[PDB]
Structure 1
Amino acid sequence: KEPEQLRKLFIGGLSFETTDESLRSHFEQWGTLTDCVVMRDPNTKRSRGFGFVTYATVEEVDAAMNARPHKVDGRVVEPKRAVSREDSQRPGAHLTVKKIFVGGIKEDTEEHHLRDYFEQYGKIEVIEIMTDRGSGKKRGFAFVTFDDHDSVDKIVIQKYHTVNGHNCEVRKALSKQEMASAS
């Protein structure tokens, strides 16, 4: 059995009217639900506008994500891979982005090294292996842009990534200003 964290989707933008039951009614169309909850304010019981659904397998999660866009109780909602409580504290953890930062890549890394690891996650649009503009020296990191934000979301929730023979660190790309704001 796969870990609960990887079987779970965050569902944002729920209608006020959505309950555990109507959410379940919709998302069971793509597999067995082991968990399904709408988050509510404890005192007022009013919906917080989001919840979670958990499938019995990650394959069912993939099937649900392939069926976007999802309309639940008359509202288009925003399903996202569930980011752990720990990781949710990091700058940019919940951004909707198509680009990843790939850190700690060998100096002799070439585009094909990145394709041979990342193409299995989604359609690649742009690969940029970064060099210093003045010196031409390799800087040890790259950016990869995909055609679907879910490709990025599914990558960054995994721990290890092997490029050009060795582990690298993969994070959602923060803009120049976001990087400054995160410092």
Structure 2
Amino acid sequence: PKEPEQLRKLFIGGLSFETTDESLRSHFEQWGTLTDCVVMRDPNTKRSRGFGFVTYATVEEVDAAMNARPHKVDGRVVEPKRAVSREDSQRPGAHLTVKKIFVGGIKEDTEEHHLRDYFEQYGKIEVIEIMTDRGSGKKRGFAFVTFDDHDSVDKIVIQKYHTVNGHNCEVRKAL
């Protein structure tokens, strides 16, 4: 019944070196129950590595925290990011932080408003590009959507399914 823990974590980059497990928790508990919260430190010096992780009890709590950005934690604006699968990563353990998606499988009957009406609930859209053939102008059956922020893309690509205009679509991070 609980969402997988991986989908409930936020990496928090850019921490003040004075941020502690306790102060990171106090801050992020404003948006949900935290089942875990840790500042990464050097194993010998105990000096902060400048990043940490928080784990919420639910995905809706992750969303609430992301919607409350920018977060100023102990005087410094931090960089929260949610996890995505390796298929949308540039190397194991690394986050491909992009604002654009490829949307495939939309065929020739899908229009800009279909993509806008669906994707606007993931984030603020800046560009919709329905791809057409360079020679004929016919729709090629794929599109790109650019958002104002990467978390929209991260939420999108972790869904198993996207149904747009009745088509089951393939969605991936782009560039």
Q: Distance in 2 between matches of 1:38 and 1:86?
A: 27
Please list the CA deviations of residues 150-171 of structure 1 after superposition, one character each: whole Å capped at 9, or x if unmatched. 2122112222211222322222
Structure that is richer in helix per residue? 1
User: Match of 2:12, SS?
Assistant: strand
Return the offset for 1:12. 0.7
Return the offset for 1:21. 1.4
Please list the CA deviations of residues 85-144 of structure 1 after superposition, one character each: whole Å capped at 9, or x if unmatched. 675455996243332111232122212321332122122232111012223232221011
Greater shift in the superposed pair: 105-114 or 47-56 = 105-114
Return the offset for 1:81. 1.6
Aligned to 1:37: 38
Q: 1:147 to 1:21 in 2, by over 3 A?
A: same
After TM superposition, the score normalised by the length of structure 2 is 0.85
Return the offset for 1:149. 2.6
8 A contact 1:83–1:93 mirrored in 2: no
User: Match of 1:105, SS?
Assistant: coil
User: Match of 2:134, SS?
Assistant: coil
Please list the CA deviations of residues 16-61 of structure 1 after superposition, one character each: whole Å capped at 9, or x if unmatched. 2222111111111111101111223334433222111111122222
Aligned residues: 174
8 A contact 1:87–1:93 mirrored in 2: no
Aligned to 1:128: 129
Q: 1:87 to 1:96 in 2, by over 3 A?
A: closer
Q: 1:92 to 1:11 in 2, by over 3 A?
A: closer
Output the aligned Cα RMSD. 2.4
Q: Distance in 2 between matches of 1:2 and 1:144?
A: 27
Q: Distance in 2 between matches of 1:51 and 1:170?
A: 29
Please list the CA deviations of residues 53-76 of structure 1 after superposition, one character each: whole Å capped at 9, or x if unmatched. 111122222221121111112211
Q: Distance in 1 between matches of 2:88 and 2:127?
A: 26
Q: 1:91 to 1:127 in 2, by over 3 A?
A: farther
Aligned to 2:53: 52
- Identity of aligned pairs, percent? 100
8 A contact 2:101–2:171 mirrored in 1: yes
8 A contact 2:102–2:145 mirrored in 1: yes
User: Match of 2:121, SS?
Assistant: helix
User: Match of 2:97, SS?
Assistant: coil
Greater shift in the superposed pair: 83-92 or 65-74 = 83-92
Greater shift in the superposed pair: 5-14 or 78-87 = 78-87
Greater shift in the superposed pair: 16-25 or 133-142 = 133-142
Q: Distance in 2 between matches of 1:158 and 1:107?
A: 24
